[PDB]
Amino acid sequence: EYKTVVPSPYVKCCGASECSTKEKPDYQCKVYTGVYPFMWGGAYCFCDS
Amino acid sequence: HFNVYKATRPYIAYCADCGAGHSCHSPVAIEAVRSEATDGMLKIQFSAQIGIDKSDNHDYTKIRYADGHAIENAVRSSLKVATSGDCFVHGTMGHFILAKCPPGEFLQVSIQDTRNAVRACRIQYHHDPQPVGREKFTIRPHYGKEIPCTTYQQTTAKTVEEIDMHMPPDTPDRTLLSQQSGNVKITVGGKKVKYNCTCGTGNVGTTNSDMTINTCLIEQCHVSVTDHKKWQFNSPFVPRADEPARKGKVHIPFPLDNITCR
Amino acid sequence: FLQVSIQDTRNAVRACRIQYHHDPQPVGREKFTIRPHYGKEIPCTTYQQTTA
Amino acid sequence: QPGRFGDIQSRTVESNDLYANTALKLARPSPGMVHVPYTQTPSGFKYWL
Amino acid sequence: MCVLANATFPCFQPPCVPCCYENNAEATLRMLEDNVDRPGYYDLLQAALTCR
Ligand SMILES: *[C@@H]1O[C@H](CO)[C@@H](O[C@@H]2O[C@H](CO)[C@@H](O[C@@H]3O[C@H](CO)[C@@H](O)[C@H](O)[C@@H]3O)[C@H](O)[C@H]2NC(C)=O)[C@H](O)[C@H]1NC(C)=O
Ligand SMILES: *[C@@H]1O[C@H](CO)[C@@H](O[C@@H]2O[C@H](CO)[C@@H](O[C@@H]3O[C@H](CO)[C@@H](O)[C@H](O)[C@@H]3O)[C@H](O)[C@H]2NC(C)=O)[C@H](O)[C@H]1NC(C)=O
Secondary structure (H helix, E strand, O other), X not given: OOOOOOOOOOOOOOOXXXXXXXXXXXXXXXXXXXXXXXXXXXXXXXXXX | OOOHHHOEOOOOEEEOEOOOOOOEEEOOOOOOOEOOOXXXXXXXXXXXXXXXXXXXXXXXXXXXXXXXXXEEEEEOOOOEEEOOOOOEEEEEEEEEEEEEOXXXXXXEXXXXXXXXXXXXXXXXXXXXXXXXXXXXXXXXXXXXXXXXXXXXXXXXXXXXXXXXXXXXXXXXXXXXXXXXXXXXXXXXXXXXXXXXXXXXXXXXXXXXXXXXXXXXXXXXXXXXXXXXXXXXXXXXXXXXXXXXXXXXXXXXXXXXXXXXXX | OEEEEEEOOOOOEEEEEEOOOOOOOXXXXXXXXXXXXOOOXXXXXXXXXXXX | OOOOOOOEEOOOOOOXXXXXXXXXXXXXXXXXXXXXXXXXXXXXXXXXX | OOOOOOOXXXXXXXXXXXXXXXXXXXXXXXXXXXXXXXXXXXXXXXXHOOOO
């Protein structure tokens, strides 16, 4: 049986990040745009979009 | 002794439904559940480590649970794990639990808050254990064979297992902004906060004392507690701080080992 | 079935039990049990707490 | 093939190389959330069992 | 066989003995995070958080 590993997301505030390829079995990586995350105390990443 | 749990803290994650069908961030969020034991014993994983009191000392009564970038403790009693029926807790250490549950289609874990308020979190899980052998018996008899199986053990010695820990991110909080009259106050108490207020010239950086910007309202100022003195966990529900990750290790208790059934 | 009960003044249980075949099925095309953390938003109906 | 016996294969128990084909696919996170959604075809070994 | 910037000391005897965590928690954590790939990481962990 396999076991999927999901590292914690890296939310970048007021900027952008690029995908990096790696030699891992069935590796997958993508970068999304326009996220405005929320946490219990509030919403960080001051930039709205 | 060794006491690895003095560099580790409980964290607040997101729970799909908190026992009432509504969603909110609870300190008892359930991570992955492991059930690779033949006899049918689960290994749930909290987000609030249990068995160690607030002062990092071992204790069979207190459990550590995070509460708004501040750790409290709760009595080990009232820790109830359940499914369609009601489970029996076998072991306990750190984040992990051992249990034996009747068949059901979900499970929740819950324990009282400081104010005797239940904090719960239920995850969808299809549980249907089957005993080793060629008969689907329910409970062991007083006369039978001895068939080998596997189960989780209570020992917490060297196990050769991994959990990744990473430095907690800056937690945003808006309860520290106090707008009095054309000025703001930033609360203290041991939390070195970060701020970024785009009101005039540069007003960014960290601090350990009360400040006033005296220029604008709170609609631009922000606070982010930068607690950087202890590993927390590498969970998908909590963001990351550095682009190449930092990572760490800590063993898990309750390794798998061979026993025999009847 | 279902039953409702609550303690009396003398701390005695007072219950009434009625036969009722309960079997809910969630709105949509899947017979799930607990809402997930990733999904769609299908309209439904429910009772609200207001007393207006 | 994903979902059937042999979705992931290893030349030996201790061998470092691994071949994995389980149709892992990432999705866009919901607005105002931090969860890293993903989908994946179930294990082929647990099905073969 | 652990390394600290330009130290290259054996992991069984870290230079922060004793009470590496109590003297500096952040420094201990960042030292540990730099030796995750080393085979001798666990000896360093055993030595860093052990003091009476
Ligand atoms: C504090 O918060 C302010 C809020 O605005 C942050 O300012 C923002 O900084 C980013 C990065 O420099 C700016 O993005 C830039 O946008 C221009 C287009 O105008 C683009 O050409 C650049 O390549 C870059 O992407 C962003 O525009 C700017 N905000 C505004 C309203 O202009 C500031 O970075 C924050 N500082 C810290 C330390 O968090
Ligand atoms: C329950 O008991 C069974 C049988 O004793 C365990 O399976 C056996 O586990 C041992 C682990 O030392 C295996 O030995 C290995 O053999 C290879 C052969 O080259 C060697 O290179 C390794 O260094 C290691 O010594 C053994 O193959 C394996 N199977 C048998 C004996 O048929 C099983 O692990 C036990 N369950 C546990 C510990 O959870």
